[PDB]
C-alpha cells in the first residue's frame, strides 16, 4: 500500500518536525521558464558531475613528486623516471577499469563548468541581472568564476605531466617570481623552495580536492540561496512586473524539468568523455625541465591569461639594481580584469546613477552601452584566447607565427573598439526594428493594389487598428516582438495524425479544437491578470 505508506510517512514527518508551511512555500515558489535561466543550472550540474568523478579519481590518485620508474602496462613509457602523480594518473588511465573514462568525463565536466559559468556570466551581464539587488550575488559569482578557473588550473596540473608541468613552470613559477617586492618570497612559500620543490603537487592536491572545492561549494550554496530567497528576476512580458514572478511552480513542472536537464547534461558529458579524447597524459610524457612541446597551452579558461602573456610586448623595467620582468604586467592585467569584473555592478551604478530595485531584466538591445561594453570585453577575451592558440593557428592555418602574434597585439586595442562600435549600432538597430514592427505590424507577402500597380507588403498589425488601414502604433514594453506571422496563429495546424498515417477526422478535430481553446484560455488568463495588475 504505497499510498498508505506515503500518508503515514508524511504524518510522521509533520509530527516529528513541522515542515508543512516551509515545504509548501518551496513547492509553490514560482520560477520563470526562460531558457537563458538554465545556463546557471548547467554550471551547477557540471559541478555536481565534477564532484562525483573527483571522488572516484581521489580513490586512485597518488600526489607526489617521488620519482619512480613506471614498470606498469603502458609500454611506450617503461623504465622512464616519473613522479608518483604521473604514475598513478597513468594507472587510472590504463590499469583501472573505466578510469580513463572517469578522468576524461571529469576533465570534460571541468571544461563545461568553465564554459557554462562564462555563458551564465554573459547572460546576467547582458540582461542586467546584477543591478541594485543581486549585485552581491554577482560579486560572489565572479569570485566563483575565478575559483573555478584556478581550480581547473590546479586540476589539469595535478597529474605531473609534460604539458601541464610546462604550464606550471611558465605561469605559477615565472609570474610569481617576477613580482617586484615579494615575488620570490611568494614563489618559495608556494613551492617550499625552488620550482621543482617536492611539495608542489601535494599542496595543489589539497587545494584542488578540499580547499578550493570547499570554497566553491560554500559560494554555490550562498549563490543558490540568494537566487532562491531573492526571487529570480524575469524578462518583461504580459503579466510580468517588478513585484511578481510569472512562471511555473517548483513541484510539478520546474523540478521535473530541472532534473531532466541535469540528466541530459550529464548524458552530454558522458557521451563526450567516451567519444572525444581529453588530455592524453600517456602521450604527454612525464614532466622534465629539459623537455617541452610546441603546443604548451592551458585549458580554454586560462587561455586568455596565457594569450595576455604572449601578446604583451616584452616591456621590462630595471630600477636601481633590480628587475621588473614582463610577468608583472600580465599579473597586474589579471588583477585589473578580476577587479573590474567583480566591481562592475557598482561601477555601472556609479556611472549611470540607477540604484532602483530592478526585478525586470532588460533585453541586451535595450541597453546599447552595456551590451556594447560586454561585446567589447568578449571580443578582447576571444582575441586573447586565440592568441594563446596562435601556435596551432599558425601551424594549421598557414599564417606566420610573428604575424599571428602581431595580429593579436594590434587587435587587442583595435578589435575591442571595432566590436564596441558594431555592437552599439547593432543594439540600436535592433531597437529600431522593434519600433518599426510596433508601428507598422509584422511583415508578410506582397500584394499588388487593385486600381494601380502599387506594391504593399500587406503587414499585420499587432494592436488595435485605426478606422482606416494603418494601425494605432503600440508603445515598446521591453519584451520581444513577433517579427514573423510564422510564430503567430498563421499556418500552424498540420494534420495531427502521425508521421506516416492520419488519424480519424473526429479525433483530429477534437485535438485541434482543444488546443485552440487552451491557447485562448492561456492568453485570456495572461491578459486578465495584466489588466488587473495595471488596473
Ligand X SMILES: CCCCCCCCCCCCCCCCCC(=O)OC[C@H](COP(=O)([O-])OCC(O)COP(=O)([O-])OC[C@@H](COC(=O)CCCCCCCCCCCCCCCCC)OC(=O)CCCCCCCCCCCCCCCCC)OC(=O)CCCCCCCCCCCCCCCCC
Ligand Y SMILES: CC(C)=CCC/C(C)=C\CC/C(C)=C/CC/C(C)=C/CC/C(C)=C/CC/C(C)=C/CC/C(C)=C/CC/C(C)=C/CC/C(C)=C\CC1=C(C)C(=O)c2ccccc2C1=O
Ligand Z SMILES: CCCCCCCCCCCCCCCC(=O)OC[C@H](C)OC(=O)CCCCCCCC[C@@H](C)CCCCCCCC
Ligand U SMILES: CCCCCCCC/C=C\CCCCCCCC(=O)OC[C@H](COP(=O)(O)OCCN)OC(=O)CCCCCCCCCCCCCCC
Candidate list 17, 94, 317, 421; residue touching ligand Z; CB under 6 A: 317
Number of residues counted as binding ligand U (CB under 6 A): 11
376 touches ligand X (CB under 6 A)? no
Q: Residues 221, 214: contact at Cβ < 8 Å?
A: no
The values of phi and psi at residue 83, to 5°, are: -80, 160
**Is residue 208 annotated as involved in ligand binding?**
yes
Window of 81-89, 369-377, 385-393, 509-517 that interacts with ligand U by CB under 6 A: 369-377
Q: How far is the CB of 390 from ligand Y (least distance, A)?
A: 5
Q: How far is the CB of 64 from a copy of itself (least distance, A)?
A: 4
- The C-alpha cell that represents 219 in the structure block: 559560494
- Kindly write out the interface string for residues 108-137 of this chain, putting x where it contacts ligand HEM by CB under 6 A and - elsewhere: --x--x---x--xx--x----xx---x--x
For 443: left if phi > 0, alpha if psi spans -120 to 50, otherwise beta; the answer is beta
Candidate list 125, 138, 153, 235; residue touching ligand Y; CB under 6 A: 125
The CA-atom distances, in angstroms, between 356 and each of 189, 236, 243, 349, 352 are 46, 16, 13, 10, 11
Q: Which is nearer to ligand X, 356 or 465 (CB)?
A: 356
Q: How far apart are CA 367 and CA 359, in angstroms?
A: 16
Candidate list 195, 329, 420, 424; residue touching ligand Z; CB under 6 A: 329
Chosen from ligand HEM, ligand X, ligand Y, none, partner binding at 50 (C-beta under 5 to 8 Å by type): ligand HEM
- Cβ–Cβ contacts within 10 Å for residue 183, how many? 20
Q: Residues 293, 373: contact at Cβ < 8 Å?
A: no
Chosen from a copy of itself, ligand X, ligand Z, none, partner binding at 25 (C-beta under 5 to 8 Å by type): ligand X
**What is the DSSP-derived secondary structure letter of residue 472?**
P
Q: Which is nearer to a copy of itself, 216 or 383 (CB)?
A: 216
**Is residue 279 annotated as involved in ligand binding?**
yes
Q: How far apart are CA 377 and CA 383, in angstroms?
A: 10
For 455: left if phi > 0, alpha if psi spans -120 to 50, otherwise beta; the answer is beta
Q: Which is nearer to ligand X, 117 or 407 (CB)?
A: 117
Q: Which is nearer to ligand Y, 415 or 474 (CB)?
A: 415
Candidate list 26, 30, 33, 41; residue touching ligand HEM; CB under 6 A: 41
Q: Residues 161, 201: contact at Cβ < 8 Å?
A: no
> 109: closest CA among 57, 62, 64, 59?
57
* Residue numbers 225-254 binding ligand X by CB under 6 A: 225-226, 228-230
**Is residue 358 annotated as involved in ligand binding?**
no
Q: Which is nearer to ligand Z, 316 or 466 (CB)?
A: 316
Q: Which is nearer to ligand Y, 227 or 438 (CB)?
A: 227
- The C-alpha cell that represents 132 in the structure block: 541594485
* Residue numbers 250-289 binding a copy of itself by CB under 8 A: none
Which residue of the chain is nearest ligand X when measured via CB? 221
**Is residue 327 annotated as involved in ligand binding?**
no
- Three state DSSP letters for 150-195: HHHHHHHHCCCCHHHHHHHHHHHHHHHHHCCCCHHHHHHHHHCCCC
22 touches ligand U (CB under 6 A)? no
**Is residue 223 annotated as involved in ligand binding?**
yes
- Kindly write out the interface string for residues 167-206 of this chain, putting x where it contacts ligand X by CB under 6 A and - elsewhere: ----------------------------------------
Q: Which is nearer to ligand U, 313 or 353 (CB)?
A: 353
Window of 16-24, 175-183, 340-348, 404-412 that interacts with ligand X by CB under 6 A: 16-24
Chosen from ligand Z, ligand Y, ligand HEM, none, partner binding at 329 (C-beta under 5 to 8 Å by type): ligand Z
Q: How far is the CB of 317 from ligand U (least distance, A)?
A: 23
Window of 49-57, 96-104, 213-221, 462-470 that interacts with ligand X by CB under 6 A: 213-221
Q: How far apart are CA 33 and CA 239, in angstroms?
A: 14
Q: How far apart are CA 103 and CA 159, in angstroms?
A: 11
Q: How far apart are CA 305 and CA 321, in angstroms?
A: 29
Q: Whose grid coordinates read 570534460? A: 108
Q: Which is nearer to ligand X, 220 or 442 (CB)?
A: 220
The values of phi and psi at residue 320, to 5°, are: -60, 105
Q: Which is nearer to a copy of itself, 193 or 267 (CB)?
A: 193
**Cα 509 → chain centroid:** 44
Q: Which is nearer to a copy of itself, 208 or 310 (CB)?
A: 208
Q: How far apart are CA 151 and CA 171, in angstroms?
A: 14
Q: How far apart are CA 521 and CA 514, in angstroms?
A: 10
243 touches a copy of itself (CB under 8 A)? no
Q: Which residues of 356-369 are buried (b: 16+ CB within 10 A; e: fewer)?
A: eebbbbbbbbbbbe
- DSSP states along 401-430: HHHHHHHHHHHHHHHHHHHHHHHHHHHHHH
Q: How far apart are CA 350 and CA 93, in angstroms?
A: 52
Q: Residues 184, 177: contact at Cβ < 8 Å?
A: yes
Q: How far apart are CA 392 and CA 395, in angstroms?
A: 5
**Is residue 232 annotated as involved in ligand binding?**
yes
Number of residues counted as binding ligand HEM (CB under 6 A): 52
The binding site for ligand X (CB under 6 A) comprises 13, 16-19, 21-23, 25-26, 136, 217-218, 220-222, 224-226, 228-230
Note the residues at the interface with ligand Y (CB under 6 A): 41, 49, 52-53, 56, 98, 101-102, 105, 118-119, 121-122, 125, 145, 224, 227-228, 255-256, 258-260, 262-263, 266, 300, 303-304, 337, 340-341, 344, 373-374, 377-378, 380-383, 385-387, 389-390, 392-393, 396-397, 399, 404, 407-408
Q: Can you say which residues are annotated as belonging to the binding site for heme b?
A: 40, 103, 106, 120, 123, 208, 223, 232-233, 279
- By CB under 6 A, name the binding residues for ligand U: 340, 344, 347, 350-351, 353, 373, 376-377, 380, 416
Amino acid at each position: 500500500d504505497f499510498a498508505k505508506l506515503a500518508a503515514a510517512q508524511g504524518d510522521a514527518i509533520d509530527s516529528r518536525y513541522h515542515p508543512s508551511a516551509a515545504v509548501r512555500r518551496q513547492l509553490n515558489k514560482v520560477f520563470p521558464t526562460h531558457w537563458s535561466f538554465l545556463l546557471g543550472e548547467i554550471a551547477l550540474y557540471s559541478f555536481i558531475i565534477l564532484l562525483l568523478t573527483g571522488v572516484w579519481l581521489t580513490l586512485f590518485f597518488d600526489p607526489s613528486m617521488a620519482h619512480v620508474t613506471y614498470d606498469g602496462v603502458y609500454q611506450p613509457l617503461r623504465g622512464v623516471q616519473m613522479s608518483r602523480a604521473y604514475e598513478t594518473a597513468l594507472d587510472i588511465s590504463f590499469e583501472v577499469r573505466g578510469g580513463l573514462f572517469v578522468r576524461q568525463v571529469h576533465h570534460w565536466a571541468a571544461l563545461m563548468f568553465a564554459a557554462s559559468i562564462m555563458v551564465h556570466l554573459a547572460r546576467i551581464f547582458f540582461t542586467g541581472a546584477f543591478r541594485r539587488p543581486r549585485e552581491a550575488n554577482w560579486v560572489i559569482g565572479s569570485l566563483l568564476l575565478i575559483l573555478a578557473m584556478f581550480e581547473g588550473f590546479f586540476g589539469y596540473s595535478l597529474p605531473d605531466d609534460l604539458l601541464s608541468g610546462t604550464g606550471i613552470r611558465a605561469a605559477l613559477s615565472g609570474i610569481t617570481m617576477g613580482i617586484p617586492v615579494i615575488g620570490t618570497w611568494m614563489h618559495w612559500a608556494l613551492f617550499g623552495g625552488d620550482f621543482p620543490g617536492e611539495i608542489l603537487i601535494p599542496r595543489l592536491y589539497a587545494l584542488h580536492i578540499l580547499l578550493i572545492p570547499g570554497i566553491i561549494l560554500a559560494l554555490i550554496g550562498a549563490h543558490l540561496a540568494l537566487v532562491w530567497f531573492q526571487k529570480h528576476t524575469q524578462f518583461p512580458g504580459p503579466g510580468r512586473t517588478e513585484t511578481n514572478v510569472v512562471g511555473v511552480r517548483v513541484m510539478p513542472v520546474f523540478a521535473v524539468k530541472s532534473g531532466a536537464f541535469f540528466a541530459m547534461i550529464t548524458g552530454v558529458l558522458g557521451l563526450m568523455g567516451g567519444l572525444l579524447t581529453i588530455n592524453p597524459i600517456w602521450n604527454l610524457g612525464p614532466y622534465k625541465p629539459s623537455q617541452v612541446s610546441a603546443g604548451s597551452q592551458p585549458d580554454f579558461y586560462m587561455m586568455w591569461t596565457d594569450g595576455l602573456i604572449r601578446l604583451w610586448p616584452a616591456w621590462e623595467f630595471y630600477p636601481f639594481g633590480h628587475t621588473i620582468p614582463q610577468g608583472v604586467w600580465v599579473a597586474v592585467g589579471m588583477g585589473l580584469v578580476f577587479a573590474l569584473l567583480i566591481a562592475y555592478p557598482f561601477i555601472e551604478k556609479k556611472v549611470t546613477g540607477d540604484d532602483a530595485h530592478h526585478n525586470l531584466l532588460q533585453r541586451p538591445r535595450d541597453v546599447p552601452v552595456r551590451t556594447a561594453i560586454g561585446s567589447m570585453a568578449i571580443a578582447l577575451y576571444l582575441l586573447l584566447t586565440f592568441a594563446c592558440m596562435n601556435d596551432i593557428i599558425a601551424l594549421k592555418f598557414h599564417i606566420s607565427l610573428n604575424a599571428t602574434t602581431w595580429i593579436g597585439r594590434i587587435g587587442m586595442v583595435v578589435l575591442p573598439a571595432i566590436v564596441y562600435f558594431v555592437a552599439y549600432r547593432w543594439a540600436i538597430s535592433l531597437q529600431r526594428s522593434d519600433r518599426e514592427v510596433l508601428e507598422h505590424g509584422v511583415e508578410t507577402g506582397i500584394i499588388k493594389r487593385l486600381p494601380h500597380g502599387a506594391y504593399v507588403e500587406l503587414h499585420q498589425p499587432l494592436g488595435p487598428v485605426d478606422e482606416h488601414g494603418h494601425p494605432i502604433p503600440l508603445e515598446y514594453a521591453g519584451a520581444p516582438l513577433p517579427k514573423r506571422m510564422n510564430k503567430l496563429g498563421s499556418g500552424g495546424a498540420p494534420g495531427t495524425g502521425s508521421f506516416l498515417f492520419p488519424d480519424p477526422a473526429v479525433e483530429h478535430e477534437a485535438l485541434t479544437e482543444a488546443a485552440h481553446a487552451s491557447e485562448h484560455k492561456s492568453l485570456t488568463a495572461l491578459k486578465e491578470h495584466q489588466d488587473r495588475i495595471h488596473g
